[PDB]
Design an enzyme around this catalytic site. Structure first.
Site, mmCIF file in Angstrom:
data_model
loop_
_atom_site.group_PDB
_atom_site.id
_atom_site.type_symbol
_atom_site.label_atom_id
_atom_site.label_comp_id
_atom_site.label_asym_id
_atom_site.label_seq_id
_atom_site.Cartn_x
_atom_site.Cartn_y
_atom_site.Cartn_z
ATOM 1 N N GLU A 133 -37.093 -37.773 6.231
ATOM 2 C CA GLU A 133 -35.807 -38.332 6.654
ATOM 3 C C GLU A 133 -35.003 -38.922 5.489
ATOM 4 O O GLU A 133 -34.846 -40.133 5.353
ATOM 5 C CB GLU A 133 -36.028 -39.381 7.749
ATOM 6 N N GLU A 240 -40.664 -34.295 14.550
ATOM 7 C CA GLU A 240 -40.829 -35.563 15.237
ATOM 8 C C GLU A 240 -40.036 -35.481 16.525
ATOM 9 O O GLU A 240 -38.905 -34.993 16.528
ATOM 10 C CB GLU A 240 -40.331 -36.764 14.415
#
Ligand SMILES: *[C@@H]1O[C@H](CO)[C@@H](O[C@@H]2O[C@H](CO)[C@@H](O[C@@H]3O[C@H](CO)[C@@H](O)[C@H](O)[C@@H]3O)[C@H](O)[C@H]2NC(C)=O)[C@H](O)[C@H]1NC(C)=O
Length: 305
Positions: A133, A240
């Protein structure tokens, strides 16, 4: 049989307590529990993403040597996963930053990735994840870091492994076309690039709320990312996702996974966030035997195994 190539879970612990660097094992961080992993493998999960901190793996400078204890404890988990025949995703859980500062030299990053990948280069079941991320950085710099990761990985002699690349803006699916259209240009000699996106189902898409905005938001938030994968001829994995243990969220997760499975030509699979031994009471704990998401979501997820 399997709805996707890959279905499984994150295995957290090695990235905990990132305020404490190097920190102490058993106090600030832990490594995942291979017995619980084996429980998930027996249930049919075949991919496990394992977060860790760059600063604990290669301290001081990312061009340096590996910390023996941290690499040993971590790679014990990686080698347990691949030794059972599942894929293990090596996840530098660092948000594009190193000691808090956004990474800004592709050479240091590439040397980091050569140092790390050289240790797994002959393991065909390892998957390298460039960084967890990226966020609030120059998009062209995010692209350049993904490319430097790829280059360092292949130059280490790790040419048979898949590489999961991640975008800016927390690599979210529902915002991919808004922020990461420039991620097309990534190149791999081995040609094994998969675009790892993340998707949560709450108002801000962070997942800090166990509430989902509607029972169809999961499906809505992945349409544009899917057509982006198809149009540009790319592959993707939802690395995720999660939802709270309530009906609306369960239905949203179901619909999102049904859609993704309908488009399994570009969507290679999914992994839940998160399992591991230090999640006790976490809203999304996939850790057997008593994790909330393990009790409430396993029966849903195993349909797609
Ligand atoms: C790593 O994971 C293993 C497997 O989950 C952990 O072992 C297990 O620990 C739990 C909790 O102490 C045991 O749970 C209990 O099971 C009985 C029913 O069989 C039940 O009566 C109790 O209410 C409770 O649910 C579980 O039996 C046990 N399993 C084994 C095979 O030992 C282990 O503690 C973990 N180690 C870590 C976190 O490092």
């Amino acid at each position: 049989a399997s709805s996707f190539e890959w279905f499984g879970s994150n295995e957290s612990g090695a990235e905990f307590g990132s305020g404490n660097i190097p920190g102490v094992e058993g106090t600030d961080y832990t490594f995942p529990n291979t017995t619980a992993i084996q429980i998930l493998i027996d249930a049919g999960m075949n991919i496990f993403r394992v977060p860790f901190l760059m600063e604990r793996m290669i301290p001081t400078e990312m061009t340096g040597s590996l910390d023996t204890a941290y690499f040993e404890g971590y790679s014990e988990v990686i080698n347990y996963i691949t030794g059972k025949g599942a894929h293990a995703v090596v996840d530098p859980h660092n948000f594009g930053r190193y000691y808090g500062t956004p990474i800004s030299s592709t050479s240091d990053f590439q040397t980091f990735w050569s140092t790390l990948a050289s240790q797994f280069k002959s393991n065909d079941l390892v998957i390298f994840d460039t960084n967890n991320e990226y966020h609030d950085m120059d998009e062209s710099v995010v692209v350049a870091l993904n490319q430097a990761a790829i280059d360092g990985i292949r130059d280490a002699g790790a040419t048979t492994q898949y590489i999961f690349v991640e975008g800016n803006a927390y690599s979210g699916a529902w915002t991919w076309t808004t922020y990461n259209t420039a991620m097309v240009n990534l190149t791999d000699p081995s040609d094994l690039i998969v675009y790892e996106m993340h998707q949560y189902l709450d108002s801000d898409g962070s997942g800090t709320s166990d509430q989902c905005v509607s029972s169809t938001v999961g499906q809505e938030r992945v349409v544009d990312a899917t057509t982006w994968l198809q149009s540009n001829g790319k592959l993707g994995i939802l690395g995720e996702f999660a939802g709270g243990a309530n009906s609306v969220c369960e239905e949203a997760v179901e619909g999102m996974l049904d859609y993704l499975a309908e488009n399994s030509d570009v969507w290679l699979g999914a992994s839940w966030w998160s399992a591991g031994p230090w999640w006790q009471d976490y809203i999304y704990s996939m850790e057997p035997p008593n994790g909330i998401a393990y009790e409430s979501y396993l029966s849903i997820l195993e349909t797609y195994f």
